[PDB]
Design a protein around this nucleic acid. Structure first.
Lengths: 115, 103, 32, 155, 84
RNA sequence: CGCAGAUAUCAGGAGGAACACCGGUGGCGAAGGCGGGUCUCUGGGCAGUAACUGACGCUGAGGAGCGAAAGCGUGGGGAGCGAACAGGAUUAGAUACCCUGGUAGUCCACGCCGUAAACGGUGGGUACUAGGUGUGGGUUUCCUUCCUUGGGAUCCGUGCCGUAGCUAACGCAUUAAGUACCCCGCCUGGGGAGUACGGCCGCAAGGCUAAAACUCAAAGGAAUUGACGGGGGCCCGCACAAGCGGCGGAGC
């Protein structure tokens, strides 16, 4: 089966980057990450990993039958818009952007400082 | 590299008992202990033999090869023991610092 | 202000403290 | 050049051919001032290629140069506990120059009994797409592919 | 006709400017009520957060009164708070 | 940690600490300290009117009470963080930084101890002593719209700059470290030492009170020049980078 239009979640952090396609309901069809692209350890914060990962996942979604996407981004990402360019290169229509990085209302204690 | 520390004992003009040689080789092994990068240790044991001296009878120059940076420790005292130990501690400062900055 | 003074203070304090950690048993079970 | 660079030398044109990459070639194969020896070696080799191919050797030379001349290479940098290699684009000047350097230095270790023959056969091999020069250039591109990740440095 | 300052011509102005503003007693008001959300939506951003005094102009009195009203409003869901 | 179906994603529920944007040289509290919201109970301060008593004031040894955090006890609860502790990695070796995990503890009730750089390193009370400048609160008059950092004057609190004056200097300066009175505590060379002995308190940790022998000829405060810096900013040199040939390998 297939879905023509869905949604996309993009989680970019300091040490990794990952994406996932999904219906607006929450049901995934396809995902990818820099670990499946092949990079390892410390290289996979670069935006190049974002390009390749998002590209592979978008092609998987093209396979399973997607043509338009809603896009939701999350986290400290050097290569957010890099992944966006990769997606729109892969042949998909950008539905709606939203920079929902989860901020708390001064809740749980974070860890200590480093040096 | 453990006997590769190229010992160089020497004195221009001093009565050099051969147990000073034991002292020197042992005090240089002591830093073989914590620096495995060592090729050359040229060393002196000098004496100015002036009358009515300025508190500084004997003198020592020491230089050592490392991989690139060479080390240099100079000292001065009345006799052999303070000279050895003082140049040793100056080298220890150098080498602690060098192996702190090496990484 | 300096810190040399406070450091000498600190060292005396610490050594007395560790002494008490080591003699916490003997002081109690002697001086009753 | 903390204050700034200086000009490049004005290459001459060849008396015979009409191309300054050939004087560049003799000046890169030169060794111990024997410029005329370089000249006669090169002219003999190019005419060997002429009798090998029935045409001008210059065209196959520039074709070999099109094969072995990159436009991308490496430029290292020490950063954060682990030195990183980086891709950097290469202007055509240094591209041609480094290509010729590859060409000579991998010509020298051949077994044609003579430099003129080694060189001529290497040029033919690179025009055809077989020389160790081409091999090393492919290794360079392999490295740039392995290290595309560090282009955002833009340096 | 006249300059924003060097007002040597009119009386001491009952008007407000870019440094000075007391925006509520100025205008845009019925009364400070957590009921009237259309008014309270003016002292925010589209992201729901709250303005500052050197943005708005209010005295701390009105500022804190309004913030408390806003916050009661978010509690009673009369106002779209920032969230999922 | 997963490959026994993780991470991600979505629907829901359980759950306990902290409550972003308001919120900062800003308000209150004697001090410590104090913000998610609503209700209850209660305290303090400010201004004005200045109707009332008519010097009742200020301080305060001793003493009582409050008092950050970590700790202790009985009980409850326990998501995240995390002493200790285990492992990984760096390391010459790392009982340490870094990573993974993780107990006591952090939280609540009732009691304890009663200390800190508990700092404005400035005890409290009071009068006079050049000013300017922002700012929080409350009064009030004029250009008066009288819907205004309106403006001016005044009172209280709070910060910056700056006279005289003062201080070893730094710098303080109408909120004084200035000018003067009243009361208290405290210091009298450094160390030994806020240590021991003795005592009081405390469940315990421990705190308060507190010496001597002996020893040194100094311990120190502020500031200047210099040198140094794996502090910063501006620059140069075959200093590296680019490029060529050498050395170390062998023989003389």
């Amino acid at each position: 089966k297939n879905v023509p239009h869905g949604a996309a979640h993009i989680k970019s952090t300091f040490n990794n980057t990952i994406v996932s396609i999904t219906d607006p309901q929450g049901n995934v069809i396809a995902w990818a990450s820099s670990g499946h692209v092949g990079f390892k350890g410390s290289r996979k914060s670069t935006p190049f990993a974002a390009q390749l990962a998002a590209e592979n996942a978008a092609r998987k979604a093209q396979e399973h039958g997607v043509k338009k996407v809603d896009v939701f981004v999350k986290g400290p990402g050097s290569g957010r818009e890099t992944a966006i360019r990769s997606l729109q290169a892969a042949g998909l229509e950008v539905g709606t952007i939203s920079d929902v990085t989860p901020q708390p209302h001064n809740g749980c204690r974070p860890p200590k400082r480093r040096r | 590299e453990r006997p590769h520390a190229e010992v160089v004992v020497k004195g221009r003009n001093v009565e050099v008992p051969d147990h000073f040689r034991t002292y020197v080789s042992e005090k240089l092994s002591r830093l073989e202990r914590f620096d495995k990068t060592i090729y050359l240790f040229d060393v002196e044991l000098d004496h100015e033999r002036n009358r009515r001296q300025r508190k500084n009878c004997q003198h020592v120059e020491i230089t050592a090869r490392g991989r690139g940076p060479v080390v240099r420790g100079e000292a001065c005292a009345d006799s052999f023991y303070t000279a050895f130990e003082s140049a040793v501690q100056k080298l220890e400062g150098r080498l602690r610092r060098a192996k702190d900055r090496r990484k | 202000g300096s810190v040399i003074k406070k450091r000498r203070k600190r060292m005396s304090k610490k050594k007395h403290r560790k002494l008490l950690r080591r003699t916490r048993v003997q002081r109690r079970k002697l001086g009753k | 050049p903390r204050k700034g660079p200086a000009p490049k030398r004005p290459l001459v044109n060849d008396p015979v051919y009409g191309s300054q990459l050939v004087t560049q070639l003799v000046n890169k194969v030169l060794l111990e001032g024997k410029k005329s020896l370089a000249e006669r070696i090169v002219y003999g080799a190019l005419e060997q290629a002429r009798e090998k191919t029935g045409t001008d050797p210059v065209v196959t030379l520039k074709r070999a140069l099109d094969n072995v001349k990159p436009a991308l290479e490496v430029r290292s940098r020490r950063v954060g506990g682990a030195t990183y290699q980086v891709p950097v684009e290469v202007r055509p000047d240094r591209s041609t120059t480094l290509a010729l350097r590859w060409l000579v230095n991998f010509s020298r270790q051949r077994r044609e009994k003579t430099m003129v023959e080694r060189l001529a056969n290497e040029i033919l091999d690179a025009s055809n797409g077989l020389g160790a020069s081409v091999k090393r250039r492919e290794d360079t591109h392999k490295m740039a592919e392995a290290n595309r990740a560090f282009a955002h440095y833009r340096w | 006709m006249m300059a924003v300052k060097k007002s040597r011509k009119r009386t001491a102005a009952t008007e407000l400017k870019k440094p000075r503003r007391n925006q509520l007693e100025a205008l845009g008001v019925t009364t400070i009520d957590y009921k009237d959300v259309a008014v309270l939506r003016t002292f925010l951003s589209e992201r729901g957060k709250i303005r500052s005094r050197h943005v708005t102009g209010l005295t701390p009195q009105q500022q804190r009164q309004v913030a408390t009203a806003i916050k009661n409003a978010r509690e009673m869901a009369l106002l779209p708070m920032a969230g999922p």
